[PDB]
Design an enzyme around this catalytic site. Structure first.
Site, PDB file in Angstrom:
ATOM      1  N   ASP A   1      -7.644   3.954   0.829  1.00  0.00           N
ATOM      2  CA  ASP A   1      -6.837   4.332   1.974  1.00  0.00           C
ATOM      3  C   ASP A   1      -7.708   4.802   3.108  1.00  0.00           C
ATOM      4  O   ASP A   1      -8.416   5.793   2.963  1.00  0.00           O
ATOM      5  CB  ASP A   1      -5.855   5.453   1.610  1.00  0.00           C
ATOM      6  CG  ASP A   1      -4.683   5.630   2.579  1.00  0.00           C
ATOM      7  OD1 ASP A   1      -4.711   5.161   3.727  1.00  0.00           O
ATOM      8  OD2 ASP A   1      -3.700   6.242   2.160  1.00  0.00           O
TER       9      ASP A   1
ATOM     10  N   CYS B   1       0.862  -1.160   0.000  1.00  0.00           N
ATOM     11  CA  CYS B   1       0.000   0.000   0.000  1.00  0.00           C
ATOM     12  C   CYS B   1       0.918   1.235   0.000  1.00  0.00           C
ATOM     13  O   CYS B   1       2.132   1.138  -0.296  1.00  0.00           O
ATOM     14  CB  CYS B   1      -0.926   0.021   1.206  1.00  0.00           C
ATOM     15  SG  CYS B   1      -0.237   0.045   2.863  1.00  0.00           S
TER      16      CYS B   1
ATOM     17  N   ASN C   1       2.170   1.627   4.322  1.00  0.00           N
ATOM     18  CA  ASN C   1       2.406   0.319   4.923  1.00  0.00           C
ATOM     19  C   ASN C   1       2.147   0.452   6.409  1.00  0.00           C
ATOM     20  O   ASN C   1       2.824  -0.126   7.272  1.00  0.00           O
ATOM     21  CB  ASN C   1       3.861  -0.196   4.669  1.00  0.00           C
ATOM     22  CG  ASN C   1       4.221  -1.595   5.194  1.00  0.00           C
ATOM     23  OD1 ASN C   1       5.377  -1.862   5.577  1.00  0.00           O
ATOM     24  ND2 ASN C   1       3.314  -2.576   5.173  1.00  0.00           N
TER      25      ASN C   1
ATOM     26  N   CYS D   1      -1.551   1.023   7.271  1.00  0.00           N
ATOM     27  CA  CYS D   1      -2.945   0.699   7.434  1.00  0.00           C
ATOM     28  C   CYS D   1      -3.371  -0.514   6.610  1.00  0.00           C
ATOM     29  O   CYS D   1      -3.682  -1.561   7.198  1.00  0.00           O
ATOM     30  CB  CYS D   1      -3.782   1.916   7.047  1.00  0.00           C
ATOM     31  SG  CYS D   1      -3.494   3.375   8.096  1.00  0.00           S
ATOM     32  N   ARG D   2      -3.297  -0.492   5.271  1.00  0.00           N
ATOM     33  CA  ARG D   2      -3.861  -1.550   4.445  1.00  0.00           C
ATOM     34  C   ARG D   2      -3.020  -2.784   4.306  1.00  0.00           C
ATOM     35  O   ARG D   2      -3.485  -3.859   4.715  1.00  0.00           O
ATOM     36  CB  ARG D   2      -4.168  -1.043   3.043  1.00  0.00           C
ATOM     37  CG  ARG D   2      -5.320  -0.045   3.063  1.00  0.00           C
ATOM     38  CD  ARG D   2      -5.361   0.664   1.731  1.00  0.00           C
ATOM     39  NE  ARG D   2      -4.275   1.624   1.557  1.00  0.00           N
ATOM     40  CZ  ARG D   2      -4.102   2.314   0.435  1.00  0.00           C
ATOM     41  NH1 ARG D   2      -4.903   2.165  -0.622  1.00  0.00           N
ATOM     42  NH2 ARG D   2      -3.194   3.278   0.431  1.00  0.00           N
ATOM     43  N   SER D   3      -1.796  -2.712   3.769  1.00  0.00           N
ATOM     44  CA  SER D   3      -1.007  -3.927   3.622  1.00  0.00           C
ATOM     45  C   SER D   3      -0.625  -4.636   4.923  1.00  0.00           C
ATOM     46  O   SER D   3      -0.569  -5.873   4.873  1.00  0.00           O
ATOM     47  CB  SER D   3       0.248  -3.622   2.805  1.00  0.00           C
ATOM     48  OG  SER D   3       1.108  -2.559   3.220  1.00  0.00           O
TER      49      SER D   3
END
Length: 154
Positions: free
Chosen positions: A126, A9, A12, A14-16
């Site tokens: 995001d 993301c 690195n 929040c998402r990945s």
């Protein structure tokens, strides 16, 4: 037989981090974690060395999952060593494509994680400026996409 997957993301944080922990859980439940090298990285370097955002960590813990990831940035080497690099949105896809052009004999397939969603939500947005419900939406998309992805990569 051993396969490697990098989740990517922008920050690195929040998402990945969420995608990595969900996939790692999945493959452990399925008793094939040995057949997998799993990691996550950032397109940018802004948060290098930092642990996941607090909201990401609370979301995961309330689904029984934990993570020890500290943020790292994607590098040139990652396009040669990973079999799949799964990212979250189209600017991430863009940046990783630009970046892969600098490698030649890139091994990695780069794809949107959302490509595997049974519900077809192609973009995992995001949640950084959002709220807890948004982290939960991200979690839910990551479960759906990681289950369908594991089934397809044989």
């Amino acid at each position: 037989v051993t396969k490697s997957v990098l989740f990517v993301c922008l920050g690195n944080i929040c998402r990945s981090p969420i995608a990595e922990a969900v996939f790692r859980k999945l493959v452990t439940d399925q008793n094939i974690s040995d057949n997998w090298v799993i990691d996550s990285g950032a397109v940018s370097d802004w948060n290098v060395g930092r642990s996941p955002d607090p909201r990401a960590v609370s979301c995961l813990r309330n689904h029984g999952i934990n993570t020890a990831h500290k943020a790292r940035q994607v590098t040139k080497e990652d396009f040669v060593t990973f079999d799949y690099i799964l990212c979250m949105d189209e600017s991430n896809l863009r940046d990783l494509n630009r970046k892969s052009n600098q490698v030649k004999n890139c091994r990695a397939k780069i794809e949107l994680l959302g490509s595997y969603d049974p519900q077809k939500q192609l973009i995992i947005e995001d949640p950084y400026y959002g709220n807890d419900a948004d982290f939960e939406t991200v979690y839910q998309q990551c479960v759906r996409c990681c289950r369908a992805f594991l089934e397809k990569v044989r």
